[PDB]
């Protein structure tokens, strides 16, 4: 019953997977918009009159 309550696959007898992989995040997409804004802000602060 307790195994049922939790998210356990309930494999072979006394054999349940916990999915410790955590999906193993490997995908990467090069977030650019943020990087472009960051760089333009460097340039802004660099050239404004302070």
């Amino acid at each position: 019953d307790y195994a049922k309550k939790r998210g356990w696959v309930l494999g072979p007898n006394n054999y349940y997977s916990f999915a410790s992989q955590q999906q193993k995040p490997e995908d990467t997409t090069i977030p650019s918009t943020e990087l472009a804004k960051q760089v333009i802000e460097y340039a802004r602060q660099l050239e404004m009159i302070v």
Partner: protein, 150 residues
């Protein structure tokens, strides 16, 4: 350097005045020496331009559009960066060796401390501006391309 002239006759004042438009130029010593306002007098020069002249004079210095989105040979980028930083190393050493002074130096003596001798501060300012501009521009181009073309 340019000017427009005309001849004063042997007669008085050569011309009549109804504005300040004549007297705004302060004629040069050489022109006076050689005869200005005695045998000849100057005239104001106007460079008035129409619309199409204005539009092409602004369009000379404009590069193609591709040049705007071209990166640099990245290897040359890195070589340039490492060269400038290897220069900043020695400039920082000299900056240290120079800030220690400016206390043991007469208020007048400082004005001559920098004649024939490198100054670390100004060179550091120049190099920092160069490095930071170049790297910012390359980064932005790389990201902008990374998005635009697929």
């Amino acid at each position: 350097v340019i000017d427009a002239f005309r001849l004063i006759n042997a007669n008085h004042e050569p011309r009549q005045t109804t504005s300040n438009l004549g007297h705004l130029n302060k004629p040069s010593i050489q022109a006076l020496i050689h005869g200005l306002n005695r045998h000849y007098y100057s005239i104001t020069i106007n460079y008035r331009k129409n619309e199409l002249e204005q539009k092409m004079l602004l369009n000379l210095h404009k590069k193609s559009w591709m040049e705007g989105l071209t990166l640099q040979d990245y290897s040359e980028h890195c070589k340039h960066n490492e060269s400038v930083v290897k220069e900043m190393l020695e400039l920082a050493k000299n900056y240290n060796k120079a800030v220690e002074e400016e206390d043991k130096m007469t208020p007048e003596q400082l004005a001559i401390k920098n004649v024939g001798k490198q100054d670390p501060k100004r060179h550091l300012e120049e190099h920092v501006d160069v490095l930071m501009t170049s790297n910012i521009v390359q980064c932005l181009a790389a990201m902008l391309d990374t998005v635009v073309f697929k």
